[PDB]
Design a protein around this nucleic acid. Structure first.
Length: 210
DNA sequence: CTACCGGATTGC
DNA sequence: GCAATCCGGTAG
């Protein structure tokens, strides 16, 4: 049973659900054992899903949890995969790819973060820094392939921005939507020495549920 | 490597 | 609204 089925004990209200950018008083480096806790913070509100966004506005946050084999993670930037293209009948939450992904819902949302007009064929922004920001969280299950994944739980790695997005056939040979994200943040990367020394200077530790 | 639940959010 | 979506978590 454990945390498989818990709701939030609390809701971040200090900003609303459609906040782009950092959540005040939640520094880069903050760690949480479980996803529900990350939601409570306001950093990444969806319980389960990879991306938080609205398809007419943008994506606010996302998570690297190694659920999608087409994710490739490079620390300072990375290539994320859109959701969907899966059959979840049977009240499932994850499956392997069984059909082509679509430029809709969160995939559309995240496409809108990119400083260039929405294009059903994908696009790049030349001035990508001027795009709408995305809170990036990394979870310990990216560790199988990524050396940037934390040993446990979830960690907040700061703001990144969608350099470009395009559709393409993934390792499974179904179409997937891919997004190139790149870091633009005021604090160091939690995995670096400097980033690590900063965690310590802030005295951040793993937060567990009360 | 399987199976599947409550709860959070958005789509429309 | 209310139906559809889901990068968890925990059992086996």
């Amino acid at each position: 049973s454990g945390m498989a089925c818990v709701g939030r004990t609390t809701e971040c209200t200090i900003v609303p659900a459609n906040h782009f950018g950092p959540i005040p008083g939640v520094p880069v480096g903050t760690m949480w054992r479980f996803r529900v806790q990350v939601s409570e913070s306001g950093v990444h509100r969806p319980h389960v899903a990879g991306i938080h966004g609205r398809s007419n506005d943008g994506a606010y946050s996302l998570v690297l949890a190694g659920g999608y084999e087409d994710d490739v993670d490079n620390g300072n930037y990375f290539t994320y995969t859109g959701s969907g293209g899966r059959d979840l009948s049977g009240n499932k939450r994850t499956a392997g790819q069984s059909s082509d992904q679509k430029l809709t819902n969160n995939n559309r949302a995240l496409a809108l973060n990119c400083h260039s007009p929405i294009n059903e064929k994908g696009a790049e922004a030349e001035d990508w820094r001027q795009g709408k920001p995305v809170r990036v969280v990394r979870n310990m299950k990216g560790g199988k392939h990524s050396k940037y994944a934390p040993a446990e739980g979830n960690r907040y790695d700061g703001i990144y921005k969608v350099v470009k997005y395009w559709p393409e056939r993934g390792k499974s040979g179904f179409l997937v939507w891919r997004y190139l994200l790149r870091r633009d943040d005021t604090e160091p990367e939690p995995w670096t020495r400097e980033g690590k020394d900063r965690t310590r200077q802030l005295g951040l530790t793993m937060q567990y549920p009360e």
